[PDB]
């Protein structure tokens, strides 16, 4: 019941600042995510689907963002990289699920969608589940930066630029990550 708004949102958030949308104490139906024919990568860890019916409506979380096609398999536990240790890191003992689907003609502009951003440069690779907003210039060891965009030291974000002329691995995949817990 309460996640018909999480999977149907008109616009998703970017990866560098994603939403931690929390569902609450209603009767949850996990037979509308299971038995969905529309999904492509349904990946649920140690708490199995169709066995979490009689469990865990204990402020379940539901993250949501959008990454490119062959990026969606950087989201498993472990799996270090660039959009999994700067942007969205989930722990090595991850419990619940990760659901992601192919937005072919819902997020791709023929000129290029240039407002889906992912972080590029960040010291001290990111802790689990921690969200950033702050955009500061990087300071990679050189002369002390103060808003410069010069040699070797520049902006930390970078747009995606989706197009319908891409292959499979570049057209955007919206990712919804579920996670369960107890008291």
């Amino acid at each position: 019941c309460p996640f018909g708004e999480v999977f149907n949102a008109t616009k998703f958030a970017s990866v560098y600042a994603w939403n931690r949308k929390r569902i609450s104490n209603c009767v949850a139906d996990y037979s509308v995510l299971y038995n969905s024919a529309s999904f492509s990568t349904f990946k649920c860890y140690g708490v199995s689907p169709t066995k979490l019916n009689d469990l865990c409506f204990t402020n379940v979380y539901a993250d949501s963002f959008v990454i490119r096609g062959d990026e969606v398999r950087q989201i498993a536990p472990g799996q270090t990289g660039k959009i999994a240790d700067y942007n969205y890191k989930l722990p090595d003992d991850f419990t619940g699920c990760v659901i992601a689907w192919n937005s072919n003609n819902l997020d791709s502009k023929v000129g290029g969608n240039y407002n889906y951003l992912y972080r590029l440069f960040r010291k001290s690779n990111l802790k689990p589940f921690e969200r950033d907003i702050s955009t500061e210039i990087y300071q990679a060891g050189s002369t002390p930066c103060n808003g410069v965009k010069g040699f070797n030291c520049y902006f930390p974000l970078q747009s995606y630029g989706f197009q319908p002329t891409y292959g499979v691995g570049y057209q955007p995949y919206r990712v919804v990550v579920l996670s369960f817990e107890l008291l």
Partner: antibody
Amino acid sequence: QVQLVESGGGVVQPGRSLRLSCAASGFTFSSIAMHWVRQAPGKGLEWVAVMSFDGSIKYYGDSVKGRFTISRDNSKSTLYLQMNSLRAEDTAVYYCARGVQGYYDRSGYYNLDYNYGMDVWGQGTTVTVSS
Amino acid sequence: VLTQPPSVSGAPGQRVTISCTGSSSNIGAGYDVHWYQQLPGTAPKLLIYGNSNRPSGVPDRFSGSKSGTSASLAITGLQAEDEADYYCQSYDSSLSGWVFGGGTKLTVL
């Protein structure tokens, strides 16, 4: 830090066998599915065996099927590869490589017919079958 | 297996492609191909997984692709360090094995 140290080096007869010991420390060993992958000297790598986080799902390579076996012990957190009828073409150096934690398929069917790669690799202990 | 060119070479600072051709029962069926850089004398290190992704430690030069039945570890601006072997690894469904490639031989000039 993580590593995959290993032991069980071999100078043995064509038809007899030995049992490897691929140890592990540092990472969560009880959740992820190790692989065994060999390299005969002169050529490139070749995949040998796989086993899951418990010991249920196991596949093999076509040169090594039915003869070899692979087992896990979560009391000493190691791997073993037993190689009965070690005939002549089965010589290599044997690497044990960490797989992934994967389990999926929304019908309850826990399985791994997977896509991912082998992240951290062993040191390799050379086995030698010689007439 | 997955066929691979036995020997390709290139001067420092160029862009050298490394092909990896497969059938329809493997990489062409929808399974991804990875890339390992095995220096002669050690264990192969994971370079690309899932056709585009680079872990922490591998630099920004190693770009991979996958289209049709192929792959390309495009090394751009190669230095005097990366002259090792490169193996592409799919997982086929005809024999359910995690099949590797024959192995290329890249040396700088």
